[PDB]
């Protein structure tokens, strides 16, 4: 994509064919969240969610022989038009994994004038880890990610046939 790119942040942009209110709500509910937010051939279980400033969202990504574990720390969401969260990779025990350092993502409106485009600034940790993702073309999997939640939106949305 023509997205902004910095040292160890990443930021993302993309155009949503739905209303500002449940293109914010997919971010800030979970009757949505675990509607859209998974990756290929795999599900995701919310165990319990709460998006608002000081707020915590725990879920988990149901993998074909995995069950991954993720804590999203919400410090500033406030109107359908700004949200912030923190990504810890989380542990049996629920807190997290403790290894690593936590993540941050604030998601702001922008580009709202028929239809909604929400900019992502993404900071992650330090040297590489950023870049390695775009080494890795993370551009395309979350606009892949993305095309799930405009279907979500949409509901009756289906165009994705067998990709070959």
Same mark, same amino acid.
């Given at each position: 994509?023509?997205?902004?790119?910095?040292? @160890?942040?990443?930021?993302?942009?993309?155009? #949503?064919? +739905?209303?500002?209110?449940?293109?914010?709500?997919? %971010? /800030?509910?979970? $009757?949505?969240?675990?509607?859209?937010?998974?990756?290929?051939?795999?599900?995701?279980?919310?165990?319990?969610? @709460?998006?608002?400033?000081?707020?915590?969202? #725990?879920? +988990?990504?149901?993998?074909?022989?995995?069950?991954? %574990? /993720?804590?999203? $720390?919400?410090?500033?969401?406030?109107?359908?038009?700004?949200?912030?969260?923190?990504?810890?990779?989380?542990?049996?025990?629920?807190?997290?994994?403790?290894?690593?350092?936590?993540?941050?993502?604030?998601?702001?409106?922008?580009?709202?004038?028929?239809?909604?485009?929400?900019?992502?600034?993404?900071?992650?940790?330090?040297?590489?880890?950023?870049?390695?993702?775009?080494?890795?073309?993370?551009?395309?999997?979350?606009?892949?990610?993305?095309?799930?939640?405009?279907?979500?939106?949409?509901?009756?949305?289906?165009?994705?046939?067998?990709?070959?």
């Amino acid at each position: 994509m023509t997205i902004e790119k910095k040292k @160890n942040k990443i930021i993302f942009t993309r155009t #949503f064919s +739905a209303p500002i209110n449940k293109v914010f709500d997919a %971010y /800030t509910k979970r $009757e949505l969240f675990e509607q859209w937010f998974h990756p290929q051939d795999a599900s995701v279980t919310v165990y319990d969610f @709460n998006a608002t400033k000081g707020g915590s969202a #725990f879920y +988990a990504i149901q993998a074909p022989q995995m069950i991954s %574990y /993720t804590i999203a $720390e919400y410090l500033q969401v406030d109107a359908p038009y700004y949200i912030e969260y923190l990504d810890y990779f989380a542990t049996s025990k629920g807190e997290k994994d403790t290894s690593m350092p936590g993540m941050h993502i604030t998601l702001n409106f922008e580009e709202v004038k028929g239809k909604t485009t929400v900019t992502s600034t993404s900071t992650f940790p330090t040297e590489s880890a950023a870049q390695q993702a775009i080494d890795m073309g993370v551009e395309t999997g979350m606009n892949s990610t993305l095309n799930q939640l405009e279907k979500l939106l949409n509901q009756k949305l289906e165009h994705h046939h067998h990709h070959h």
